[PDB]
Amino acid sequence: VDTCSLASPASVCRTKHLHLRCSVDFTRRTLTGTAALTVQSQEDNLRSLVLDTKDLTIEKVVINGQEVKYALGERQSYKGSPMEISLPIALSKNQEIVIEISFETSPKSSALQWLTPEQTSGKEHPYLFSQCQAIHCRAILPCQDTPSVKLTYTAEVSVPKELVALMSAIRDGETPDPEDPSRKIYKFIQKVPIPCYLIALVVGALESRQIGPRTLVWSEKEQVEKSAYEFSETESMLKIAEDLGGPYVWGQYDLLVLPPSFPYGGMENPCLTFVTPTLLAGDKSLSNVIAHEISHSWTGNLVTNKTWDHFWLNEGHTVYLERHICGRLFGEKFRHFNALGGWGELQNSVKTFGETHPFTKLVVDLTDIDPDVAYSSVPYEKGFALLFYLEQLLGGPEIFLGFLKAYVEKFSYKSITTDDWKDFLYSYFKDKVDVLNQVDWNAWLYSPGLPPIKPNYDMTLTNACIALSQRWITAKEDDLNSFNATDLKDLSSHQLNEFLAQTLQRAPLPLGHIKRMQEVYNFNAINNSEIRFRWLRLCIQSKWEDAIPLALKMATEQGRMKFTRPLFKDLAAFDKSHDQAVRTYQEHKASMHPVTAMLVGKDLKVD
Numbered sequence: 001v002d003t004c005s006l007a008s009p010a011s012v013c014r015t016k017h018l019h020l021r022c023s024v025d026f027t028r029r030t031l032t033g034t035a036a037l038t039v040q041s042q043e044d045n046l047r048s049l050v051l052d053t054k055d056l057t058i059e060k061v062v063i064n065g066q067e068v069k070y071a072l073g074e075r076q077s078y079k080g081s082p083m084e085i086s087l088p089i090a091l092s093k094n095q096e097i098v099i100e101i102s103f104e105t106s107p108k109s110s111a112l113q114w115l116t117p118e119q120t121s122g123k124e125h126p127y128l129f130s131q132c133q134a135i136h137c138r139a140i141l142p143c144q145d146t147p148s149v150k151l152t153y154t155a156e157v158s159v160p161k162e163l164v165a166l167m168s169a170i171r172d173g174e175t176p177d178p179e180d181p182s183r184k185i186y187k188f189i190q191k192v193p194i195p196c197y198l199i200a201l202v203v204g205a206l207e208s209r210q211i212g213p214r215t216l217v218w219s220e221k222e223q224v225e226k227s228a229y230e231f232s233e234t235e236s237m238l239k240i241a242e243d244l245g246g247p248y249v250w251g252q253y254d255l256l257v258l259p260p261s262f263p264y265g266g267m268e269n270p271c272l273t274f275v276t277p278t279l280l281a282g283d284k285s286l287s288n289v290i291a292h293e294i295s296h297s298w299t300g301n302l303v304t305n306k307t308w309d310h311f312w313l314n315e316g317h318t319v320y321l322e323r324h325i326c327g328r329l330f331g332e333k334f335r336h337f338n339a340l341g342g343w344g345e346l347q348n349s350v351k352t353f354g355e356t357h358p359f360t361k362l363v364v365d366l367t368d369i370d371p372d373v374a375y376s377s378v379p380y381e382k383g384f385a386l387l388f389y390l391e392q393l394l395g396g397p398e399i400f401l402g403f404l405k406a407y408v409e410k411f412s413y414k415s416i417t418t419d420d421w422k423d424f425l426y427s428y429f430k431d432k433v434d435v436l437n438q439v440d441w442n443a444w445l446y447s448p449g450l451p452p453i454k455p456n457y458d459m460t461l462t463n464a465c466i467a468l469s470q471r472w473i474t475a476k477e478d479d480l481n482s483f484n485a486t487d488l489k490d491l492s493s494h495q496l497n498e499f500l501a502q503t504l505q506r507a508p509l510p511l512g513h514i515k516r517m518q519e520v521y522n523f524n525a526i527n528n529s530e531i532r533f534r535w536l537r538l539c540i541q542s543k544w545e546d547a548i549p550l551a552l553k554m555a556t557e558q559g560r561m562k563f564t565r566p567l568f569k570d571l572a573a574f575d576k577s578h579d580q581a582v583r584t585y586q587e588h589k590a591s592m593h594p595v596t597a598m599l600v601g602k603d604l605k606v607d
């Protein structure tokens with residue numbers, strides 16, 4: 001049972017295909033069109049079915065060429081409104097019909113962000129992008145908005161002729177719109193069954209450059225060159241990922257660099273990964289996000305969580321594959337460094353919610369919980385830590401990678417639960433069941449807080465970060481003179497980030513220590529978004545007023561939640577910047593991503 005969806009479950013009827021025909025109206029901020037769903041009955045004598053909708057205007061429902069009766073239920077908060085449709089003829093089990101729905105989206109759709117010319121790089125054209133994960137596909141079209149249903153799709157998108165439409169699918173052509181010469185129709189085909197949260201659309205003044213034999217990087221003209229260099233390791237990562245997970249079934253692996261308000265680091269949309277421009281560090285240092293997005297082509301896209309309570313299956317396995325890719329490219333000592341950093345990030349997540357909080361559980365109960373509110377580092381890191389613990393318990397990376405490949409093969413094109421994963425783990429490791437019976441499963445899967453066991457980590461690359469961090473924490477006024485730019489000479493960008501994360505865990509530090517850290521290390525000059533973020537957090541939490549304009553700027557110039565949310569919270573918790581944070585939020589709210597605006601408002605407790 002999927003508690004986040006109001007649609008008929010997979011045991012009643014299953015959507016097999018979507019044929020989407022729509023037009024993007026920028027003056028009205030609406031998507032208008034038809035969604036023809038091929039639905040297969042799973043029951044005898046089926047006479048009605050329910051679909052998920054969220055702020056959609058329904059014009060009509062057509063079956064067999066005639067209008068049918070439908071009814072829209074009362075809105076159920078973040079879940080939206082149920083749409084019950086009365087079928088004209090009762091269906092037998094396995095019978096397939098085509099239901100065509102005429103719909104229109106709301107300009108306030110929580111799936112979309114409509115950007116004015118001023119909000120883009122070019123300044124001449126508007127832009128539109130979607131983000132359906134977890135449950136925002138219902139805010140675009142009527143569907144069974146659950147990952148337990150996998151469908152194929154085709155689409156025809158009418159857009160102003162000067163603009164380009166792209167989807168999480170293979171490009172199948174473009175023609176002038178016959179009903180309007182100022183418009184262009186873009187055609188798309190997704191022939192691999194996908195859960196509907198993987199449906200994605202972007203409309204804008206987009207340009208592309210080839211960077212690999214199966215990869216184009218897409219972005220506005222101004223970011224093309226930087227993005228092509230930033231993501232040049234894409235193909236080498238795909239090759240490694242194919243070696244670990246088996247064949248790449250999606251044909252194309254394109255990348256799209258979104259405008260700065262993109263709410264996440266990346267989004268694993270089939271054929272076209274969406275990424276934040278905050279990755280454009282200039283040295284490929286933030287490429288682990290591409291490795292994560294690539295890994296999802298197996299773990300998440302092929303093997304999917306049946307419900308949002310099992311989201312850790314998608315994330316945990318993706319982080320595990322991500323760290324193997326980076327370990328193949330940069331060495332095992334580097335995989336351990338990233339694994340160790342991940343544990344640190346889990347420690348922070350558990351502290352923020354509290355060690356008893358239900359969102360610190362690996363397997364959650366999302367009954368009456370908005371998935372956007374539950375979202376955190378927990379499924380990623382507690383999920384990673386479990387797998388890394390099993391890897392060490394079961395005989396190392398080579399043995400565990402064998403399980404992972406077999407896991408993807410066993411569950412490809414299917415939606416699964418934790419019990420399914422656990423059952424196959426025991427089946428796969430039958431000769432090591434006694435070892436598996438030592439795992440405290442109830443604590444690992446169902447308990448809040450830090451895991452009952454911490455894996456073993458190589459410390460080589462972490463040691464210098466720890467030593468530097470401890471020098472700064474234990475320093476007194478008379479020790480500040482000993483610090484010099486030479487302290488950093490042998491530290492990588494990654495190690496510098498880890499020095500800051502280590503220091504930030506013991507924040508606040510005395511104001512004089514932070515003024516000195518700027519004087520000798522000039523952290524204000526670093527443009528790398530991960531470093532800059534942690535450095536500004538450390539300045540604000542340590543009460544440095546000079547950092548207020550800098551943190552406010554970073555929180556509003558980009559909108560990646562990982563950065564925007566803790567910056568606003570830090571600025572709101574600092575007395576000197578509290579009122580500024582509140583006013584800035586209020587002034588930017590209307591031009592923010594709807595989900596970001598929602599969550600920041602909750603974190604700030606603003607009306």
Ligand SMILES: O=Cc1ccc(Oc2nc3ncccc3s2)cc1
Nearest residue numbers: 133134308311371372374375376379
């Ligand atoms: O990337 C965007 C996104 C992805 C998933 C999502 O929903 C969930 N987040 C969780 N965190 C913990 C446990 C379960 C869940 S379900 C919301 C937004």
Ligand SMILES: [Yb+3]
Nearest residue numbers: 171172173189
């Ligand atoms: Yb074709």
Ligand SMILES: [Yb+3]
Nearest residue numbers: 476477478479
């Ligand atoms: Yb001293």
Ligand SMILES: [Zn+2]
Nearest residue numbers: 292296315318
């Ligand atoms: Zn992910």
